[PDB]
Design a protein around this ligand. Structure first.
Ligand SMILES: COc1c(C)cnc(CSc2nc3ccc4cccnc4c3[nH]2)c1C
Ligand SMILES: [Mg+2]
Ligand SMILES: [Zn+2]
Length: 313
């Protein structure tokens, strides 16, 4: 009850900044997450025995893939921590509980392959879930782990609060399907400009939470340049393996996944920042002004990719 987690001084300070990197010491990541839950939610939000057992079961159900791994889960949860901390009063007690857990679980049991690859392969998950295939799988796995004896961190919620939190986590995880991001952001853009955006409207809150999930999920583009650049190696390591497997099915992959088109990475990064990253953090900054450091970090990184193209690095 009186047991806090404490980090070393450099981590205690930098963990509050949007651009924090959680470091290469895997054994510290669970404590970093518990620290963030305690400061974000309270030391009473969860029974520490059940939370610790939830964390270690979630860790076990992430695989050894280059990018969609346990480091990504904790990284995405840290970005959500920074958003919630910088927007103290805008979120309910249930939303703060649900969203950090949602981020930790958002890519559970990822195999390193896109929804398109599962469909073209004719993978069983593609028959079970026709759209947002992996994201429906990730939520399914989250419910499974919550139902293990000793793992139900929500047990002290009432029946209706339990149903509300699972529903927050479900929409939050579905919203990390990038196919759905584009329409979600256009709607939030119209609503903000015509002035109809209303944060007491549940359907509006849902949309805003969806954008927060895209922002946290893409947060490698908001780090210091050396982190952004080294994470891009892991992202393309997964993509190029998928392209290899497309060729095995007799299908030319899109250039993003074809290792033979490495040379076009810098130009592909520009398109991604201009079409997805910048618009995402711009709309998020309009709705939640204190998230501006993410937009500023994203624009810095766009500038670094432009310098790569101009041969300056
Ligand atoms: C997970 O989201 C991402 C993040 C965070 C960073 N980078 C990316 C990759 S963006 C990207 N879009 C394209 C389009 C054509 C390409 C042709 C040749 C090489 N790379 C390409 C590329 N990379 C993604 C998808
Ligand atoms: Mg995902
Ligand atoms: Zn993810």
């Amino acid at each position: 009850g009186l047991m806090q987690f404490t980090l070393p001084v450099r981590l205690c300070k930098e963990i509050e900044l949007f651009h924090f990197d959680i470091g290469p010491f895997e054994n510290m990541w669970p404590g970093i997450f518990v620290y963030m839950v305690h400061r974000s939610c309270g030391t009473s939000c969860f029974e520490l025995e059940k939370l610790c057992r939830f964390i270690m079961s979630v860790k076990k159900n992430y695989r050894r893939v280059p990018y969609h791994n346990w480091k990504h889960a904790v990284t995405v949860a840290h970005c959500m921590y920074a958003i919630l901390q910088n927007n103290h009063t805008l979120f309910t007690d249930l939303e703060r509980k649900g969203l950090l857990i949602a981020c930790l679980c958002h890519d559970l049991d990822h195999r390193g392959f896109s929804n398109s690859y599962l469909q073209k392969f004719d993978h069983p998950l593609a028959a079970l879930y026709s759209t947002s295939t992996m994201e429906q799988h990730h939520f399914s796995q989250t419910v499974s782990i919550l139902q293990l004896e000793g793992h139900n961190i929500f047990s002290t919620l009432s029946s209706s609060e339990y149903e509300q939190v699972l529903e927050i986590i479900r929409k939050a995880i579905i919203a990390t399907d990038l196919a759905l991001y584009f329409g979600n952001r256009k709607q939030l853009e119209e609503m903000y400009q015509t002035g109809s955006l209303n944060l007491n409207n549940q359907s509006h809150r849902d949309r805003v939470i969806g954008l927060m999930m895209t922002a946290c999920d893409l947060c490698s583009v908001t780090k210091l340049w050396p982190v952004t650049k080294l994470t891009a190696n892991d992202i393309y390591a997964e993509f190029w393996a998928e392209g290899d497997e497309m060729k095995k099915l007799g299908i030319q992959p899109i250039p993003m996944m074809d290792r033979d088109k490495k040379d076009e990475v810098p130009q592909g990064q520009l398109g991604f920042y201009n079409a997805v990253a910048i618009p995402c953090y711009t709309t998020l900054t309009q709705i939640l002004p204190p998230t501006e450091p993410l937009l500023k970090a994203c624009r810095d990184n766009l500038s670094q990719w432009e310098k790569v193209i101009r041969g300056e690095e």
